[PDB]
Write an enzyme that holds these catalytic residues in place. Structure first.
Site, mmCIF file in Angstrom:
data_model
loop_
_atom_site.group_PDB
_atom_site.id
_atom_site.type_symbol
_atom_site.label_atom_id
_atom_site.label_comp_id
_atom_site.label_asym_id
_atom_site.label_seq_id
_atom_site.Cartn_x
_atom_site.Cartn_y
_atom_site.Cartn_z
ATOM 1 N N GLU A 1 0.867 -1.188 0.000
ATOM 2 C CA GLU A 1 0.000 0.000 0.000
ATOM 3 C C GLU A 1 0.904 1.239 0.000
ATOM 4 O O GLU A 1 0.799 2.088 -0.881
ATOM 5 C CB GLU A 1 -1.038 -0.048 1.128
ATOM 6 C CG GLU A 1 -2.081 -1.146 1.000
ATOM 7 C CD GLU A 1 -3.004 -0.957 -0.185
ATOM 8 O OE1 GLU A 1 -2.959 0.108 -0.849
ATOM 9 O OE2 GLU A 1 -3.780 -1.890 -0.461
ATOM 10 N N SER B 1 -12.763 9.715 -4.232
ATOM 11 C CA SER B 1 -12.323 9.380 -2.892
ATOM 12 C C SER B 1 -10.801 9.348 -2.856
ATOM 13 O O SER B 1 -10.152 9.306 -3.900
ATOM 14 C CB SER B 1 -12.874 8.018 -2.467
ATOM 15 O OG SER B 1 -12.306 6.972 -3.236
#
Lengths: 130, 130
Positions: free
Chosen positions: B35, B51
């Site tokens: 990530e 988002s």
């Protein structure tokens, strides 16, 4: 900030680069030398595709970092390109690691292919005590 | 903050992640690696649904945290997204636990499905004494 050779060698070693993905510290050094001359503030704007290479490893805004101004860009490191222009190179190092975790490894950098690959690079780490 | 691998492993274990909902420490480490590269300041904007993913675990503003800029969003972790960009990762750990409380568990992160699921991930905790 412009790193001195041995200063950079020790920093990269401290930051887990030596042998990362089979890539020696000397190779990372050769990459930094040819990309930026060890200059963390280096930027290279390519009028061609309107992308920019950032920082000591010259990481490109089209695929790897976000500068909010590059057409058709993705942000695979999930990071602002400004984070790659800092004196502290931890983010740049984390992103370089992410780059070489992709299939083509350090060959992603054309400068490294041309000036480092298959060549003697032992002099980059000579006398640095790393 | 950019965590060193073993520093993060020990920190996550201290915060009760190892075995949380059946998820090993090594799996949380693989998640964080793919990530954010262990970077608490990572961000990724998703033009698709307006988002943004925040922090070390890249937690999304549409469902999990409030960034005041995401249409139709909810705030299931009851946190502003700014809390997920901080050096102290207690809030980010609490939010990741909440995410995996849902039925699909860690499968919520597509990066984890692509780079971690079903694969050997022992490398992530090797040599960390955890």
């Amino acid at each position: 900030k412009v790193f001195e050779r041995c200063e950079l060698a020790r920093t990269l070693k401290r930051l887990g680069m030596d042998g990362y993905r089979g890539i020696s510290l000397a190779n990372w050094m050769c990459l930094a030398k040819w990309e930026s001359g060890y200059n963390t503030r280096a930027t290279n704007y390519n009028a061609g595709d309107r992308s920019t290479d950032y920082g000591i490893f010259q990481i490109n805004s089209r695929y790897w970092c976000n500068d909010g101004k590059t057409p058709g860009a993705v942000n695979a490191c999930h990071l602002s390109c400004s984070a790659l222009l800092q004196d502290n190179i931890a983010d740049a190092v984390a992103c370089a690691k992410r780059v070489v975790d992709d299939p083509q490894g350090i060959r992603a950098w054309v400068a490294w292919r041309n000036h480092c690959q298959n060549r003697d690079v032992r002099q980059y780490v000579q006398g640095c005590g790393v």
